[PDB]
Each structure stands twice: as structure tokens, then as C-alpha cells.
A and B are shown apart, each in its own frame.
With several copies, the nearest count.
Chain A
Amino acid sequence: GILQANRVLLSRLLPGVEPEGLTVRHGQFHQVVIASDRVVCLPRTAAAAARLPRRAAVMRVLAGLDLGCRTPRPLCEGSAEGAVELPFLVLSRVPGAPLEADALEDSKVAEVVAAQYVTLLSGLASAGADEKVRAALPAPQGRWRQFAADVRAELFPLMSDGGCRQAERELAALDSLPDITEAVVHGNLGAENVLWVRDDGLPRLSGVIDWDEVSIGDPAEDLAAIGAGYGKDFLDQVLTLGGWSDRRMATRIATIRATFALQQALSACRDGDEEELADGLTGYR
């Protein structure tokens, strides 16, 4: 389908590579073709193509942050950021695999994994206090209010009445969330986007992928993702180690965490991933 439609371009970008041997991650704006060492963003529309120059800049900025790990490095030339649009963007592929939750049942592993999360999130937080970083990244205002609107508009039609009532209580608290624009926020920091090397010892953070939703925002959004994936005990260890276990932060996390499945559903809805939509909508229909 995608691989087929883009065979010619892909044979230029990946010479001698069989396009059937590649994988695809669906995005809102780009289809992402996954090769062994790199990744190719293909714009779904003219609008999407117009976004790739800025995406190139964003990924360059991320590549320069002190996160204690790798990020997808843009493999275009710097002048690509000056273009009106690009027909593709190639990024380096971060090595490693997600950490399955049950690994954290060993407490020494949990300590070491928590600490590397903290290094990452601390790097993201300090970068969000950097004026040049803040100038390079999107920082929408009233995103929570608008997110609730987007859920009601786009997901409620796919939900049962029970599901809509469950969602409403979850969306309810969002309007009273302080609107925080203080950290670089990944915006989708589920386990599948955090990659580890665990060959030669305890899990070591290789890097982080899928920065499509990155912004200047509330660090509670990334902490919520961790909480949704790994639960309260592990989250609390990250908060303790990072110095973020205060009542205000914990409250925001709880509020955002209650919406995280809906965030995944909204994204899956927009990027046409039916399986991730099904999962996201679990217990809402």
C-alpha cells in the first residue's frame, strides 16, 4: 500500500533494499517507513509536506539536548529547514527494544530504570527553561480544554453511552488544570517509545522515539504516560528520585493519567491505526 505507492522514492533513499522488507508506523501527518538503520517520514498531504522543514529543525534541536540518551537525528542537510515543504525526511533509527513491565518486579532493575527516566525527564525539564529551545518548539495554549473538545467531537461518536459518561468525568477535571508550559514534553512517552539495551547487564536507556507530539508543556503529561504504563509504585519511585513527588504535581499527573487512554485513542483515530484505536477505546464501548 504505502510501501508500494512509494517504491520509486524508497529505492532512491534505500538503494538495494526490498521495500517489502520494511515496516510502517502510521502518524497523523506522516507515514513513517522503518528500515534497519533509519526511518523515512513520508507526508500524507501537501499540508504535511509543509510541516517537514519545521520537523527537521525540531529534531535537530532535540539531537542537541542533554537527555542521557539518543534521539532520532535528522539526516537531511540543515538548509532543508529553509524549504517551503519537503517530500520526505530521513531520521536515524534509535536502537534497542521496549522494556516489558514485569522487568520492574525486580527492585534493583526498577531503581536503575527509574533513575534513567529521571535523567531523561530532568534533561527535558531544563531544556524547557531554555529560551532558544522554547522558541523552536510549539507551545499551544489551553490544550487541555481543546483536547476535551477533540475527544467529544471525534471519539464520543465511537463510544457507548456508558463510555461517554466515563469519558466526561475524566475530561471534567481538565478545565481546572493549571496550563503549564515549562518543560520539553514528549507527549506520547509510553513504554513502546522508550528503547533499552539489556544485552550486557541491567537495562540501559538507548533512546526515545516518536516525537510527533513534542512541545513546551506540562511535565506531568510525560509522568502520566509512565504511570499509565507501569503503575503507581514505579511512578512514585521516579517522582521521588526526580524531586517531583509534591502534591500539586501528583494531582496534575492523576488528572492527566485518567485521560491517557483517550489520548492514545484520539491519536489512533487521526492516524488510521485501527488496532491502537480498539485498544485505546477499551472500556469506552
Chain B
Amino acid sequence: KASSXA
């Protein structure tokens, strides 16, 4: 559960 592109 990559947030803002990670």
C-alpha cells in the first residue's frame, strides 16, 4: 500500500 508514488 504504496502511498504518494511509493
Chains A, B in direct contact (C-beta < 8 Å): yes
Residues of chain A touching chain B, judged by Cβ–Cβ distance below 8 Å, are 187-191, 212-213, 221, 224-225, 228-229, 259-261, 263-264, 267, 276
Interface string of B1-6 (1 = CB under 8 A from A): 111111
Bound: A195/B5 CA distance, A: 19
**Is the pair A187, B1 in contact by a Cβ cutoff of 8 Å?**
yes
- Nearest first, the 5 A-B pairs at minimum CB distance are A190-B6, A213-B1, A225-B6, A228-B6, A263-B2
Contacting residues, chain A, for B3 (C-beta < 8 A):
188, 190, 263-264, 267
Bound: A212/B3 CA distance, A: 11
Contacting residues, chain A, for B6 (C-beta < 8 A):
188-191, 224-225, 228-229, 260
**B3, closest chain A residue (CB):** A188
**A229, closest chain B residue (CB):** B6
Q: How many A-B residue pairs have CB under 8 A?
A: 40
Bound: A260/B5 CA distance, A: 5
**Is the pair A225, B1 in contact by a Cβ cutoff of 8 Å?**
no
**Is the pair A264, B1 in contact by a Cβ cutoff of 8 Å?**
no
Given contacts A213-B2, A224-B6, could you give 11 more A-B pairs where the C-beta distance is less than 8 Å?
Answer: A187-B2, A188-B1, A188-B3, A189-B6, A213-B1, A221-B2, A225-B2, A228-B5, A260-B6, A263-B1, A264-B4
Contacting residues, chain A, for B2 (C-beta < 8 A):
187-188, 190, 213, 221, 224-225, 228, 259-260, 263-264
Contacting residues, chain B, for A229 (C-beta < 8 A):
6
Contacting residues, chain B, for A267 (C-beta < 8 A):
1, 3
Contacting residues, chain A, for B4 (C-beta < 8 A):
190, 264, 276
Bound: A221/B2 CA distance, A: 9
**Is the pair A261, B1 in contact by a Cβ cutoff of 8 Å?**
no
- In the assembled complex, the CB of A194 is this many whole angstroms from the nearest CB of chain B, namely 11
Contacting residues, chain A, for B5 (C-beta < 8 A):
190, 228, 260-261, 264
Bound: A221/B6 CA distance, A: 9
- In the assembled complex, the CB of A116 is this many whole angstroms from the nearest CB of chain B, namely 18
Contacting residues, chain B, for A261 (C-beta < 8 A):
5
**B5, closest chain A residue (CB):** A260
Bound: A121/B1 CA distance, A: 17
Chosen A-B contacts, 16 in total, with CB atoms closer than 8 Å, are A187-B1, A187-B2, A188-B1, A188-B6, A190-B2, A190-B3, A190-B4, A191-B6, A212-B1, A213-B2, A221-B2, A225-B6, A228-B2, A228-B5, A264-B3, A264-B5
